[PDB]
Design a binder for this molecule. Sequence first.
Ligand SMILES: C=C(/N=C/c1c(COP(=O)(O)O)cnc(C)c1O)C(=O)O
Length: 382
Amino acid sequence: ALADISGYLDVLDSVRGFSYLENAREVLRSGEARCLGNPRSEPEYVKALYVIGASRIPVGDGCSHTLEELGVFDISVPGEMVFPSPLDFFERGKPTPLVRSRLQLPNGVRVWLKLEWYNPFSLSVKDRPAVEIISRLSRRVEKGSLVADATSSNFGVALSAVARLYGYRARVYLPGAAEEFGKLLPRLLGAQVIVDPEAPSTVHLLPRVMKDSKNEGFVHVNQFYNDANFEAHMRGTAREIFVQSRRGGLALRGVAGSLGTSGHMSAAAFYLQSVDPSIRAVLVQPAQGDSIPGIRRVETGMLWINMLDISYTLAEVTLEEAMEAVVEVARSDGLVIGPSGGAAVKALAKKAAEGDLEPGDYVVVVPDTGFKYLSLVQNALE
Ligand SMILES: C=C(/N=C/c1c(COP(=O)(O)O)cnc(C)c1O)C(=O)O
């Protein structure tokens, strides 16, 4: 029949590698999953179902079940929006909103904005990998232990709140150019903060964090390499775009977004392209010389967007163009989005103007709120 997946999640601690994603892709492509005789004997298939958002798995001898039958489309949110704890609110208070913009783009490209600031700890998309990452730790790593990572600002905040709710201590490392909220808010939340005014980037800090890890023995959760980041976005962000698009009546032709770790947009593109491989992924390339907070250029070794069978198209965006999009979204929708969000809107507008996109509905993932970036806002005004 069906069994509750929550009983089988130790496969998250034992499955390794990307091969399980073949099952994920096929179940999503076909719209259904085959019965697992002994579910414990097919740990890859079980992880595949978890990662696409199933809450139930098919077991025993018997027939295949559809995505809907596996819970992929179940409603989690209580309609009255009352929650017994902050973590329960994070988990069941989903999806994040998907809102049609009044901003007009060329060639029949209709914009919808997915507002990831609607996450309770960091007011950003980074809550999701923080929760998934800390959760995966929490029965191999003893309480009281120190966990740490490098961050542009958002993950550090998320990691600080979530580490403490799970009984861990945290430390976050930031580059000198990070926003003030990233430097300060983790201390509010009880974490240690190290700012390296030398470091020109978040990734530039990773050798130092690794070395301190070896010396001091804290757990480096490494969001740039930890697959729980990608997994969080498969079951959360990406599934939601899929479910929201079907249930909302959208003619989904593409998603648009930005890349730091590449975690959220790799998941969105991977998930959606499993269901329909023509769905586009338009991704921001910050123009050379420019810094758009939280994000960076593909070249390098970002993990998932390169290693996974993902189709995408890049558009160059300058910081000035990104902030101009912030301005225009604000004046069109009354919504105040962050620079990376503006950059994504602009990348979609550019591809739309070139004639490269089928008319239809396009989802832009807006990683956070522009309230956090006042000095960039001021510059953009003049
Ligand atoms: C790497 C981080 N942030 C990613 C981020 C991103 C990129 O998201 P992914 O790491 O999932 O690629 C986009 N926009 C903003 C405002 C962000 O903070 C961090 O907060 O450490």
